[PDB]
Ligand binder design. Sequence first.
Ligand code: 18S
Ligand code: 18S
Ligand code: 18S
Ligand code: 18S
Lengths: 811, 811
Amino acid sequence: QISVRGLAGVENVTELKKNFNRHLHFTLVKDRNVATPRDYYFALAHTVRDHLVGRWIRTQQHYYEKDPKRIYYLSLEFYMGRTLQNTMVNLALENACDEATYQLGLDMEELEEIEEDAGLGNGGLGRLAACFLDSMATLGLAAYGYGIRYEFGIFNQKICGGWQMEEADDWLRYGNPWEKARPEFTLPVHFYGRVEHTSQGAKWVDTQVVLAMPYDTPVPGYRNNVVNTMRLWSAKAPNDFNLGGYIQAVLDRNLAENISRVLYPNDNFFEGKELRLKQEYFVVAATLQDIIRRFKSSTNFDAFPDKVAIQLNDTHPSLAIPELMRVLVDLERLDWDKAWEVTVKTCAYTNHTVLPEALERWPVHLLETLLPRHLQIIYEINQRFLNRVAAAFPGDVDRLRRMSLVEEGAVKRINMAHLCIAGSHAVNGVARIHSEILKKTIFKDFYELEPHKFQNKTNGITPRRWLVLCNPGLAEIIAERIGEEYISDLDQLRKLLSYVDDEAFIRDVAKVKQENKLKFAAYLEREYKVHINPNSLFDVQVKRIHEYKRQLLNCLHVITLYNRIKKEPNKFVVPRTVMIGGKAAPGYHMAKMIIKLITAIGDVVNHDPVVGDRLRVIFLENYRVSLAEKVIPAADLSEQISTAGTEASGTGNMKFMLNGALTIGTMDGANVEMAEEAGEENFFIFGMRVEDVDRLDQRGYNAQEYYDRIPELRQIIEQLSSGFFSPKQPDLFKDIVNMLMHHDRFKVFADYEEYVKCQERVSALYKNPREWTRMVIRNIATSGKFSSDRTIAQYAREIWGVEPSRQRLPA
Amino acid sequence: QISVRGLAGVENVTELKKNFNRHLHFTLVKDRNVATPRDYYFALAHTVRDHLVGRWIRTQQHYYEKDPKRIYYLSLEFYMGRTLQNTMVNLALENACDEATYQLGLDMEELEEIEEDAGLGNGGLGRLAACFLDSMATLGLAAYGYGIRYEFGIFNQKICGGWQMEEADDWLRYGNPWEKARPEFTLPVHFYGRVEHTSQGAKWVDTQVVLAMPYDTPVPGYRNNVVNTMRLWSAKAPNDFNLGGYIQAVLDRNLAENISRVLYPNDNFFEGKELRLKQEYFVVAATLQDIIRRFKSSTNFDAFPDKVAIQLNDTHPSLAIPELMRVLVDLERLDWDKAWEVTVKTCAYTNHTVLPEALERWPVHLLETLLPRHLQIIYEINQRFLNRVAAAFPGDVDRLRRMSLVEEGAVKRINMAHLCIAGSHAVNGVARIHSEILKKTIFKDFYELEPHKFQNKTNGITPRRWLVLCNPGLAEIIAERIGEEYISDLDQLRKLLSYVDDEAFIRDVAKVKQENKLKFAAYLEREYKVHINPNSLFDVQVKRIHEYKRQLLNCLHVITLYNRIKKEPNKFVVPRTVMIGGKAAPGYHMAKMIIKLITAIGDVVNHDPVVGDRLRVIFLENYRVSLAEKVIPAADLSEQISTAGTEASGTGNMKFMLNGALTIGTMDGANVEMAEEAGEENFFIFGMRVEDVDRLDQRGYNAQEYYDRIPELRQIIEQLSSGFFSPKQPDLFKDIVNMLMHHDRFKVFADYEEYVKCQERVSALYKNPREWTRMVIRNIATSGKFSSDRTIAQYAREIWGVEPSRQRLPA
Ligand SMILES: Cc1ccc(/C=N/NC(=S)N[C@@H]2O[C@H](CO)[C@@H](O)[C@H](O)[C@H]2O)cc1
Ligand SMILES: Cc1ccc(/C=N/NC(=S)N[C@@H]2O[C@H](CO)[C@@H](O)[C@H](O)[C@H]2O)cc1
Ligand SMILES: Cc1ccc(/C=N/NC(=S)N[C@@H]2O[C@H](CO)[C@@H](O)[C@H](O)[C@H]2O)cc1
Ligand SMILES: Cc1ccc(/C=N/NC(=S)N[C@@H]2O[C@H](CO)[C@@H](O)[C@H](O)[C@H]2O)cc1
């Protein structure tokens, strides 16, 4: 149908159809009379995956022959979403499969909806890993993602009576067509035990052994025939494990296999839970053995850093540092200083937050029991590091206690971030302002000691998933004017600037959005039975529920608009559909209250006859990658409204910019760079800058001051307190009111006036469709910087020491 | 190479080779440079299984079109063993695959050794189910095996320091190429809850739900293009299950899934363990819903028994009876009497033992908690049944308490065997003598009430696995003389009687055995590092370790031969290799001692220089179906020496007879029929008959009497007591001696003299190879009756009311 989706040649269509029927018969053991829709999806998935195998085998063979430096991306999260369409896109098979399935009498889009998301991540950090893998494959890097194959990914969110309910994401139930178990590469991982010191150095003995079994998933590059590997470890009990008593022993195998059972969803508050530590060590131990095995299959560890880069995705795999030391020192018998040199040059650390409650600080007593040798190595790293600090800053005793990897206190803890900085040759934040905040505040001491380690690598998103796949209409009208090269060279979108006054292009951009909004309005009626006005402004905030992300500020605005309507019902207002979506971490009480507030607001607003269809508030249930692919192209306004200094980068922001939504946001995270690229005139910037927040903290934030001086804010609070939004439970929202009035870390009230005013300027612009669209064009045209291809090229050159290559491997 | 293994046509070999390379590439994601031996096995398994699919789909389609009466074989055990060779045999693909793999540079036999046994059974009852499935497919019956897909089958046995060690049989670790998950047929199974009585009858409410997910495994008939289904249920938690607390809730899903985790290996002693009851109900509930679903997809349950037979393989699925009643009464609203009529006519029960400690007698309090509605139905069945007994035998109050399904006592129990008899139109034992023992003793009261219910169906073994597959040499020399028809018509083996004096045939039979013995002697050196004389008599006893099976009696004989040698070292004795193998139930202390005794005897005997290679005692580790396929063809003497009245049938006995071993045995179980078929002159029968045992029990068995009157027996006991076989632990075997002397239920000493004497007659015959072989020929020629095809044809005609058919389905 559309050009960017590839050729539907006669020979290819015929072959796809025959292979589809082959798989239906031989793989699914079905014929057309008994086939379920799920069978059809699997026949298609198997048909498509067949095209990956030659490329996958030869990509890996290529790396063995050429022996390039290998990139190991260690993450506990890979938020992959669905794989079928992505694979077709990157293989140029989409139109062909569409045709082939059409001739077979099937709707491919309906088949695509059957695939479960690989929801092996929580939010931004997990999706970043996924975008990165895609960019690394597209840029021809010898890169491997390493993580855990969770049996249960992020929970499915259900909303019952306005409340979030979690249910197990049993994503593997029907089997995953995209993975290949690799049992011959099964590796033992050790836990507990004790350290014996001999003449021949330390020995870690009496350990419990869990097996790590790898599963390989293909990561296809964009039309370059490169297929990289994502290797996820699953926990398996050894067969002599725990071996009435016989039965129990077999049942207790579950204990060892619990390690890979479930993704921790608490992206808000670090919990020192032992199972989480086991998961962190599990992925690190298995991965490092696999890395070293591959390194040897080419004595001399001097060349290790020339052949290996390990990227630590936050501190979650920080145990890579003492684990590498452990292997190098205890098993390979390198001296400490040489092992350390190798380690530092091998590892790099990416920080993804400044919220102190999110920092990993593992209780010493836990490491003592679980990983006794690692604790010893950590103490040793700390001593030698603190000797360096003492020498560089003689007499600065407070610097010593601030920089220590060991924090003294009630429970002694290890600061994993301090471990990562000490053990890495590079440390980067994920947006310019965030990287600066690291240098100036939380890692200031470390920056003063080793300024050369600190870098910025502004986040990006893959334009394959986040444009071509989810927004083919927009990709097509762009390709019509500038060709297809921009898909793997997003900077080329700048060429669209000379179309800002092009009437046809303005008409096309606005029509694509309208079509996207219509399709999403339909999706909402079909799957959720809710009726929205597609001519309204689509005002969307989708992201995990956090106080810092200030879904609450959006709530206050919603209520203001509602109250203004109720005050002057016969005044014209630009109609809005306000959509808020996102999961709350199950133990985050405030976030669950916020969700309930949102639904409670919807309950009042969506049923007020006076409101009509001028204002609708919808909570988007079960926000996840596949839902983002639908809602983002349909959005007009992107809410990026975190308190300045709190969102390290954001990536949702970039997805919206790429897909033709205007952004209302604070100068926070990557918003700053987005506004700089587009020009501030084409952005709706409001609120305190970082400096204003700091000034406020010095004086002391008094929420009452705002409540006393803003009558519209007072009314809202009074309505919240008195039970206007919870008639049967008048005090339901007292926690929220209390927090807002007395202990708001994120200064919701401080930005309220400016936000509302800025929101009026949004409504004003939307009244003028032509000028709205010209501003949109100016955003899309400048979103090039935010391609993860750019981010990855920067990592490759500035951190990993490898050159990207856009060259095809032979097909 | 050999004719019975099929044609190796040019077109087939070429196609097998190309499909093998296709699977290696596309399915295993490998090329020849990186392929492991396990990859080669899987490529072959996938290549072969491709040939099953058309036949499987059309067999099932056929049943839907023709709508024949369906046979449901309910078992908690299906001891399938390996599937690859069996499939090739039944599809006539063996020579072709052998050729194809040979040209690819692979040894197919080496590939076959990689396949794990499906060890979903303990011993005879589980193997019976497997042979039966094979015969039902071969006889063109619309038959389904239903059971549980255990994650862990029978434990792998390791022998450490002469002691049995169990390890988990993780048979699914690499994936099972022979199964197809059928998630669309997932069914809920209910546990716990309570019964509400309404106006509209009883209601079972507030239950916990476990999901039952079916996996289908093909059961190919012998060259008739029929492929039946074995459907095994796996336990899955529902997604709202149990839904810090979030993490635990996800982890607790294991509790529900524990149901299908592991096969209970306690074939010796009924344990009223709740998990076992859950497994029994699980397979019954899921199966019955599946049966009823299939019945409806053709209101009128009158025709249910015309369309459905359910065979209960022992009492383990006895809950089928009250479950059928429950569905019919509570869910379909049939009146009791009509539901009962339907139930009785639908169900038949096969008893597999008379050992009272093996009978299922479930504590009432367990049924109360787990299955409250079923208990109520059982009480109701009992009342109406006992009303029938009272009416037929007025005043016989003791009959009433003996026949009750409820046993009063300390804990009230339900006698599941009594439930099965009451709820079934037919009850059968598994050998003529066993069926008679049921009528005369343990079910006498029931036989007097309903004599028409009691039948015999003498056990059988499939000649496909147990001749063609494991003994191709013997199958071939037989086919050379009489053609190939006997493979699915084993009675034709009688034709071999006219070859008893045929010199060429005598030479061939003896040569096949010699080749088999050589191959097995090699197998023992290669995989276990033990060196045996292939010219010795192969004296084998392989079967689960039980006191009743009297491995101990064999032990006494072994020691007698050893002592006689030591007494007169320079006298000629026919050399023997004595092989004993079998697993002990992990909690069966005596059985574990017996294994230790056997190894301890081996330790002494195998290292006595005076003995030489005249006597060797070897414990065959990890006896299982795939090992039986090796050892049985190599055996000369089959030890079938259970105390008369204790082995219901035996089937190992039939395997040995078919494969050219002579049998030393008691008149017990099917031995009686084997001796009758072959003629007693061609059998080594010894020991007490059933009547002699009964006489002994009346007087009282005094083991001392034998110890006092048999000096050779005294010496053995003294040696056992004094530490001759355990020098470092002199009292190690005091339990055995004590049991033998004071509490031997199985009268080991009573048969000792006759056994030893009979064993001399065996040695005498073996001295004359020509006459040994002529007797062997006379056994093989009369083993026809013991084909499970005969057994199944009897079930079909006399119990299920269906005609077998040897006709091909179109290919
Ligand atoms: C891209 C690509 C290409 C080929 C393959 C081949 N895959 N080949 C096998 S046999 N895949 C297996 O299939 C099962 C699916 O039910 C999984 O449960 C199992 O984990 C997986 O290893 C996998 C991925
Ligand atoms: C269990 C657990 C513990 C901690 C976490 C942390 N999760 N941390 C995230 S999702 N960090 C996010 O990373 C993105 C990518 O750089 C940024 O754009 C975004 O600003 C930042 O908040 C998640 C789960
Ligand atoms: C005889 C026959 C013919 C075709 C098939 C087709 N089978 N097709 C699939 S996708 N089989 C799956 O394969 C996985 C193996 O790794 C299993 O883990 C899984 O349980 C099984 O359902 C199965 C049996
Ligand atoms: C957990 C558990 C509980 C009970 C059992 C019972 N297992 N019961 C067996 S294996 N019964 C056997 O059945 C064969 C087939 O008819 C007969 O030839 C044989 O004589 C008989 O002993 C097995 C496991």
